[PDB]
């Protein structure tokens, strides 16, 4: 239960696990991999369960009119609208936003939001092809073939090799990092809003669109909590904050997706009540149990999941750090699956 440290000069890209700046040389625990600085060593304790300033690191009207969208079969309803498979220069996904009567004030904010969502182009992001005002509101996104992550993990329950499982978690962080890079809060990240395009490329959908959720009464948008709470951060549950939907609220939701992929079960699988979860989670009494994980999950990898689920939002890391950490062990994955050996002894002192 004691951290043995080693002088290690990181050759790849790594961030200190207190200060979270670019780490070059410092210390590493040979148990977990909780790498950290030498400068801010006297501020941070052990957690397993004048200096040279940095340099260059290494290098590796959008409104659709009537008579164009052939609205096909009803697919399913959501928390702010229902999906139909429409035709529009190929297969698209139409969404009749629950807000059918938007005020000239809500309508303007929607057109402004669509402006940003239309300027998004990433391999791990579902394409946003505008909307339609004649037949009410109906977001039109790229039609996904195959099936959702929620469908593949809790419907058919077809578990995949940890290699393929980690890869899905990597590509999600890749698409999520892009959204936060363009300062877009997802407000909805969950396995239901992640599709596996032809079984390989991760596609994140139903992101942003803050103005079509929580119906307005004039010029306001108090987010009336609705939809699903298994992914909602405790700060988001309370809604007591002026805004509960931050990057960290999205990072927490991401941490719940990690739990889903890792254990194959949705969090809190021992409660037959929704209201009990809303209250206890928002009160900081209920947490996703970390005793139902596999008996081969490295401490370094598992710890990342635990960091995203921090009750206080300010403790959770950001996606540039998460994606680096996810990738970090994707490379040390096969070598570390083999049995443990005799370690090097203490060789440290503070």
């Amino acid at each position: 239960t004691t951290h043995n440290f080693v002088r290690k000069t990181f050759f790849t890209l790594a961030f200190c696990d207190f200060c979270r700046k670019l780490l070059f040389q410092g210390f590493r625990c040979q148990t977990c991999g909780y790498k950290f600085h030498q400068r801010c060593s006297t501020e941070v304790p052990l957690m397993c369960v004048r200096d040279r300033s940095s340099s260059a690191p290494n290098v590796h009207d959008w409104e659709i009119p009537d008579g164009q969208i052939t609205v096909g079969q009803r697919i399913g309803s959501g928390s702010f609208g229902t999906v139909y498979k429409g035709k529009w220069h190929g297969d698209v996904a139409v969404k009749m936003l629950n807000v059918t009567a938007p005020t000239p004030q809500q309508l303007q904010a929607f057109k402004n939001e669509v402006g940003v969502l239309r300027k998004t182009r990433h391999v791990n992001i579902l394409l946003f092809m505008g909307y339609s005002t004649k037949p009410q509101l109906a977001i039109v996104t790229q039609w996904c073939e195959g099936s959702s992550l929620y469908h593949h993990l809790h419907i058919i329950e077809t578990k995949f090799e940890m290699i393929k499982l980690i890869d899905i978690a990597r590509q999600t962080a890749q698409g999520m990092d892009y959204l936060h890079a363009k300062s877009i809060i997802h407000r909805d990240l969950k396995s239901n809003n992640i599709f596996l395009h032809e079984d390989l490329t991760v596609k994140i959908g139903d992101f942003g669109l803050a103005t079509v959720k929580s119906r307005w009464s004039g010029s306001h948008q108090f987010e009336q909590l609705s939809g699903s709470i298994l992914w909602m951060a405790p700060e988001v549950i309370r809604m007591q904050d002026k805004n509960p939907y931050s990057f960290q609220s999205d990072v927490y939701a991401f941490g719940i997706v990690l739990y889903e992929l890792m254990t194959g079960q949705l969090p809190y699988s021992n409660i037959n009540n929704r209201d009990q979860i809303i209250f206890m989670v928002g009160r900081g009494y209920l947490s996703p149990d970390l005793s139902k994980v596999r008996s081969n999950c490295p401490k370094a990898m598992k710890r990342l999941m635990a960091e995203c689920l921090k009750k206080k939002r300010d403790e959770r890391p950001l996606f540039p750090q998460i994606l680096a950490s996810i990738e970090l062990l994707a490379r040390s994955l096969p070598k570390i699956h083999r049995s443990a050996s005799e370690p090097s002894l203490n060789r440290a002192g503070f």
């Binding site: 040389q25 300033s53 290494n58 590796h60």
Partner: protein
């Protein structure tokens, strides 16, 4: 064949060995054929990692040299080990500049490639500037000064205020101003100016480089917040 050499160098890069990689990429450049965009980043990573390991060795040996504070043969031996690793450090940087100014800089069709190789040249002259203390300092300091000024003219002319390379040049040239010349006023001015122009075209951020762009951005902000204290 070139592809066997670049696969060998790439494979050796995956194995975390930066001696066979550097030897393979020196053997690539010795052919005297112009590199792609892809083949160049490998060369920069190899000859950054090799000096980086010796830099870390130099820093910790020099800290122990300033830590001992006695009168014995330990200080003489630590000085012998410092001049040893310093000479090893000199041999690597001279091999790089010998491989750079004979095959790549004089045969550089792409102006973007010219900003890249002149950024590398200024970097390795700064790497020799920080270690060599005496009369020879004033030669390599002025050499890096000319190299970065030459790169800064073409950056201001025909580059984007949101391109990774111009941001890297601005970053290396700002830390050059702070560490080597110790004029933090012009380094503060430079980094603030480079950071402001970097804000203008924040909308113009394609997938090709969002991570690099925001990574040099937050590093620029960290350097600013260190220096304004």
């Amino acid at each position: 064949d070139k592809e066997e050499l670049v696969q060998r160098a790439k494979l050796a890069e995956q194995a975390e060995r930066y001696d066979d990689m550097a030897a393979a990429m020196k053997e690539v450049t010795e052919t005297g054929v112009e590199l792609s965009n892809e083949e160049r980043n490998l060369l920069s990573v190899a000859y950054k990692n090799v000096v980086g390991a010796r830099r870390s060795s130099w820093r910790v040996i020099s800290s122990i040299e300033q830590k001992t504070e006695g009168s014995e043969r330990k200080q003489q031996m630590a000085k012998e080990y410092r001049v040893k690793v310093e000479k090893e450090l000199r041999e690597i940087c001279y091999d790089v500049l010998g491989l750079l100014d004979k095959h790549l800089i004089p045969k550089a069709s792409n102006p973007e490639s010219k900003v890249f190789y002149l950024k590398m040249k200024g970097d390795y002259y700064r790497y020799l500037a920080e270690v060599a203390t005496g009369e020879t300092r004033n030669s390599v300091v002025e050499d890096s000064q000319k190299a970065y000024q030459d790169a800064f003219e073409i950056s201001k002319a025909k580059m984007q205020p949101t391109h990774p390379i111009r941001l890297g040049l601005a970053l290396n040239f700002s830390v050059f101003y702070y560490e080597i010349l110790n004029s933090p006023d012009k380094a503060c001015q430079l980094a603030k100016q480079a950071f402001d122009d970097a804000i203008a075209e924040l909308d113009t951020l394609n997938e090709d480089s969002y991570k690099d762009s925001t990574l040099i951005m937050q590093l620029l902000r960290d350097n600013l917040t260190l220096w304004t204290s």
